[PDB]
């Protein structure tokens, strides 16, 4: 998948303003991430789209149909989208299986086709052995995965996922996220993810909308957000940074306590502001010979948002490395791989 | 702080084993992190400590007093610890102010001392302007912080914190955890945190217990857990790693297709195994000319699991970086330009 457009949307609770003149589009098949500080309005936005909250002005359209505006306000039932709530509350008196079955057909999961879709959701999320559990019989991350499976089962053209993975250990989240998003993309599905995992957003988002106090500071690709953030607030939200008051010079540097540093800016010389350094930009020299120095050949370089993925031939194997930046090889190909420190060795009774 | 002793503790549900021969110890004022894959038994362990669940076997003692055993089983209200449940669960019919007041004195929050302590908790967690709200008027991360404020207000000698920060954006979680753990340490408090944030555990834990399928895989300092893991299983849970089939040599190197690499092991030469390299150990050379170079002097050097914390006098600042004798001269390089934001 669905297109979505939200135009000038605003929402207040009593004297409490929360969404302030928000505009946002989602293209068919697009994976959009919405991120921002606690309390900035993410869940309220999703609830306004799904019809659980009523905006007090603005417009919302979904796949070419107005669903909210000065003269329309469709019931939740008439809004063709899926919405995994941040609470992920399951029906207490239903089994995991029957929770997942709920949004398919008559809800009972008696048909072979339902059984097969439900089992596929259980396998994706790694909870097949818990199909007969009731929700009170589950850990926090097991309950989270069952809620995710139930949301995903009907495979809506648009799905809104409000922190679908926040209770899950890293390796688990990484597997589910990759398998799930590949499958959404394979099927042309549109999705909006709320996340506060910076690496997740940078890796998987087509575009990221960064919110602050009910407004959108910036909506951009991961590469543009990270390297060309609109604001210092956006820059600090998307990554760690070390900041100093600074005065811009005319030669592409700025002065700060640390020193005179090259800086990306087109503002006039004499502008005052703040300069930000990413911790990965620093190194200290000289350096000891590395534990191992190996000769390597660069096969392929692929820029990502905040790193470059390098394909390598070193010794007699090929590795892929993620590094803050690419090496300068007068050759374009000839490099030296360093290992810092001993590796670990495990005798592996496999 | 209060010391804690858990001894050969187990628990099954129905006929479903969930905690299996847990032993675990906490010295006064120690900060322990418990981590492990989803379903491994972290919350069940905490519930058994707090008396919400009853173990089948084993002993729990608190500051030297046996609280669970074959012959003893102190009710919840009698166990002198605080416990922040992974759901948080605020009292829905009380404001945030009265929720945080609840564990102080008569719960009314009418004494100047109570008002002061509630203000301290509202400020630590950044929710001062929400203190008049009810829980259903709050965002998920605000509800989480109010629940944390409520649990921390009585300042118990032992506090159990099951995922107290999981709904919070990075800057917020960093500030709250730095301020709060510094305060706990300054006051000598003992704390057990459950987390799945690896950096967090490695930075703040005095020890980390890694659980797997109901058992303790390894309990150790962050340095030991990360640099001497018990298990390729434990190694990969605590951090990333690139692996290679390798064969052990006798000079403390291992053969693998990448080369003859120095390795840490005591095993017998000839042992075939897996070599594991952490991503931080890799670099590719040569690097580009640096955008800038700043002369620096090393002030101090604090070893951590994945890096060393170095204090440096450079230009006209002191900078502290995660990246050598503590008085040496060195040069800081900056790779690429910094960003500049007009005021
Ligand atoms: N009534 C019950 N019957 C059977 N198993 C149960 C019951 N209650 C909990 N469990 C199981 O106990 C195991 C441990 O649960 P616990 O909540 O302690 O895990 P956790 O480590 O805190 O998980 P997470 O990281 O997902 O929060 C889980 O596998 C869960 O399925
Ligand atoms: N009934 C209400 N009355 C007044 N303010 C409310 C009410 N409900 C929510 N809010 C406020 O609206 C703002 C947006 O809340 P929302 O749940 O959308 O935030 P969020 O970005 O999802 O936050 P988090 O990251 O903490 O989950 C918050 O500051 C919250 O306190
Ligand atoms: Ca939210
Ligand atoms: Ca748990
Ligand atoms: Ca070989």
Residue numbers in the entry:
A (entry chain B): 2 to 351
B (entry chain A): 2 to 324, 330 to 349
The authors write:
ABC transporters form one of the largest transporter gene families and use ATP to power the movement of a wide range of substrates across the membranes of both prokaryotic and eukaryotic cells. The first 240 amino acids of each FbpC monomer show the same overall ATPase topology and sequence motifs previously observed for other NBD structures from ABC transporters (Oswald et al., 2006).
FbpC consists of 352 amino acids and the structure shows a domain-swapped physiological dimer in the asymmetric unit cell (Smith et al., 2002). A divalent metal ion is found coordinated between the β- and γ-phosphates of each ATP and the Q-loop glutamine (Gln87) in the electron density maps of FbpC. Given the high concentration of calcium in the crystallization conditions (0.2 M), it is highly probable that the ions observed in the active site of this structure are calcium. This suggests that the presence of calcium in the cofactor-binding site may have caused the catalytic dyad of His197 and Glu164 to adopt an unproductive conformation, although His197 still makes the trans interactions to the carbonyl oxygens of Ser167 and Leu169 on the D-loop of the opposing monomer as observed in HlyB. FbpC also contains an additional C-terminal regulatory domain of ∼110 amino acids (RD; residues 242–352) that adopts two OB-folds per monomer. Unlike MalK, the domains in FbpC undergo a substantial domain swap between the two monomers.
